[PDB]
Amino acid sequence: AISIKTPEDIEKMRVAGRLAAEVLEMIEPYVKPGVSTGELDRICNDYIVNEQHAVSACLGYHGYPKSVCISINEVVCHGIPDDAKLLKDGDIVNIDVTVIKDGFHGDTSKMFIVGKPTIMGERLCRITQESLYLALRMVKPGINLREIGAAIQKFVEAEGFSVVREYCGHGIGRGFHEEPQVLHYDSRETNVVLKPGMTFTIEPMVNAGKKEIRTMKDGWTVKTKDRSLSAQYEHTIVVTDNGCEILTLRKDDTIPAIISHDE
Numbered sequence: 442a443i444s445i446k447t448p449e450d451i452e453k454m455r456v457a458g459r460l461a462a463e464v465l466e467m468i469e470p471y472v473k474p475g476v477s478t479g480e481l482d483r484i485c486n487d488y489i490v491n492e493q494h495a496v497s498a499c500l501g502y503h504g505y506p507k508s509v510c511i512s513i514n515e516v517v518c519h520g521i522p523d524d525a526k527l528l529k530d531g532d533i534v535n536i537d538v539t540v541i542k543d544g545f546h547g548d549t550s551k552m553f554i555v556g557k558p559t560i561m562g563e564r565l566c567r568i569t570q571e572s573l574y575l576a577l578r579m580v581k582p583g584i585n586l587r588e589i590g591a592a593i594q595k596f597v598e599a600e601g602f603s604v605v606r607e608y609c610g611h612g613i614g615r616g617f618h619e620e621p622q623v624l625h626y627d628s629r630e631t632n633v634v635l636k637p638g639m640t641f642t643i644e645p646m647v648n649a650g651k652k653e654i655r656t657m658k659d660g661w662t663v664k665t666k667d668r669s670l671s672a673q674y675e676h677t678i679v680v681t682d683n684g685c686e687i688l689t690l691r692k693d694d695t696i697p698a699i700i701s702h703d704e
């Protein structure tokens with residue numbers, strides 16, 4: 442059931458969302474050529490635990506081995522931090538974070554371009570973040586989630602990219618994943634009219650090539666079937682009386698934290 446968060450819970454969600462975003466702001470200086478994804482994960486975990494006094498919702502979830510998910514280039518999601526995996530110039534890397542604090546979850550991720558960027562890499566990431574932004578600008582009471590999914594897809598496909606169908610955004614609160622499902626493409630099964638108090642994520646996964654994906658034998662790593670690049674950005678938001686409030690905004694975001702549609 443889609444729950445409406447109380448003002449009190451929403452504040453707890455702001456706290457958790459801020460922490461999740463700060464993990465990403467903290468890790469920035471470390472995302473450099475030569476660094477291992479394994480070390481990046483250890484830095485985030487130490488920060489979450491020793492500094493934020495929070496916990497990673499990913500650790501142990503369905504047996505997931507690390508504190509954050511780190512996906513590089515062709516890897517679509519659930520990449521596993523590994524000490525032998527080194528970042529290099531041109532890489533596009535997603536670091537996905539979910540922390541629990543005072544019982545509530547903050548879920549967010551962003552792409553990082555390592556060293557000297559590649560134009561195609563920058564473009565994929567830019568378009569992906571823009572697809573998230575256009576969706577955020579649509580969130581307000583009364584709108585149907587299907588309209589947002591359709592808009593994300595239209596935009597992405599127009600750029601010659603594709604949207605991954607296997608994964609979606611989700612309601613969030615005392616639980617990591619709660620109703621409703623937030624598809625990033627058009628579907629007849631989607632009929633969710635938004636209302637104030639609802640909290641959920643928007644996190645499109647976009648492939649530069651075809652939408653098809655495959656999972657590696659490690660049981661976790663998901664890559665694009667055609668080995669094209671894939672990018673993802675995610676934000677946790679709360680629907681307000683006249684729009685929405687992004688709970689995981691970072692200083693590098695270029696969209697307002699509070700979006701209002703009132704005159």
Ligand SMILES: O=C(O)c1ccc(-c2ccc([N+](=O)[O-])cc2Cl)o1
Nearest residue numbers: 499502503505510519537548644675
């Ligand atoms: O941002 C998210 O929702 C997210 C990051 C990684 C996951 C996740 C989802 C489902 C499973 N699973 O084993 O079904 C594992 C993870 Cl780490 O979800």
Ligand SMILES: [Mn+2]
Nearest residue numbers: 537538548549
């Ligand atoms: Mn996430």
Ligand SMILES: [Mn+2]
Nearest residue numbers: 548611642644
């Ligand atoms: Mn999520």
Ligand code: NA
Nearest residue numbers: 513514516671
């Ligand atoms: Na990727």
